[PDB]
């Protein structure tokens, strides 16, 4: 059921907190139970420099939190 | 004797729960499962100290040692 | 996957950032690989004639070019606050 409430906000913008002072806001395109996620129009904040990609795959074992901004 | 009995016989008694990380909990053992997800009551979390009120589900993954009494 | 590499000298990068040089002579799904004549680059010493190295430690495994051997957490919380 948690996984299904995530299904709820696909194509919509989400906020991911990663391991190691990392943060990505991008529109959610695809995810799995493992947590690995696919974002489009993403923007990564490191701690503070910025980084932009149009399409990134994220590896699930680094994901701490997902919510929307 | 089995370890999974000693744990059971500590139900409704003071237990110490030490995690692999340098962090422990003392509380009354309320119940547990086959993965050793412990239910603690009025838990005293150490590291540097927090007082919990009620039932806590402590994750069985990080559990390293169980101590009756603590 | 690691079939192209077997029997060929390769450069391996460890998760701890350490580097090795060896010959890949067997591997599993886990990615643990049975290497021969292993040499640690950081220590610059021959580790063994034959070893079994666990998959988890390894990060990456490079096919050494036969024609070109160029081979040789807490404060985090504070941040969130400052923001």
């Amino acid at each position: 059921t948690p996984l299904d409430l995530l299904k709820l906000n696909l194509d919509e913008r989400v906020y991911i907190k990663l391991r190691g002072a990392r943060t990505l806001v991008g529109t959610l395109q695809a995810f799995d139970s493992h947590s690995n996620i696919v974002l489009s129009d993403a923007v990564e904040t490191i701690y503070e420099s910025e980084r932009r990609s149009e399409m990134v795959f994220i590896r699930g074992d680094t994901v701490t939190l997902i919510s929307t901004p | 004797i089995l370890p999974l009995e000693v744990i059971d016989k500590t139900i409704n008694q003071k237990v110490l729960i030490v995690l692999q990380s340098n962090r422990e909990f003392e509380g009354t053992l309320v119940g547990f499962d086959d993965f050793v997800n412990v239910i603690l009551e009025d838990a005293v979390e150490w590291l540097k100290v927090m007082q919990h009120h009620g039932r806590m589900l402590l994750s069985g993954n990080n559990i390293a040692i169980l101590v009756p009494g603590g | 996957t690691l079939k192209d590499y077997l029997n060929k000298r390769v450069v391996i990068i460890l998760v701890d950032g350490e580097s090795l040089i060896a010959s890949l002579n067997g591997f599993d799904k886990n990615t643990n690989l049975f290497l021969t004549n292993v040499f640690n680059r950081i220590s610059k010493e021959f580790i063994s004639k034959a070893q079994l190295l666990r998959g988890s430690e390894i990060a990456l495994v490079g096919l050494i070019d036969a024609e070109n051997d160029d081979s040789l957490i807490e404060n985090e919380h504070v941040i969130w606050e400052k923001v």
Binding site: - | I1, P3, L4, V6, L19, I63, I65, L66, P68 | -
Partner: protein, 65 residues
């Protein structure tokens, strides 16, 4: 592969996943390698816990002391 039977009532030394040494007398076990230890001493220096149960999931090495 390890018959804990021969270690019963003996002082054994167990290292645990997390960087935690534990020395005690083996009093009982199971096939998941969950241990009962008495006169347990744990190291990070040192403190003597009483009777303890050790989780075999986090068990990493085991020998005599």
């Amino acid at each position: 592969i390890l018959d804990l039977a021969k270690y019963k009532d003996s002082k054994i030394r167990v290292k645990l996943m997390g960087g935690k040494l534990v020395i005690g007398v083996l009093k009982g076990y199971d096939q998941l390698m969950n241990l009962v230890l008495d006169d347990t001493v744990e190291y990070m220096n040192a403190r003597k816990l009483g009777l303890t149960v050790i989780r075999g999931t986090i068990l990493v090495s085991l020998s005599s002391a």
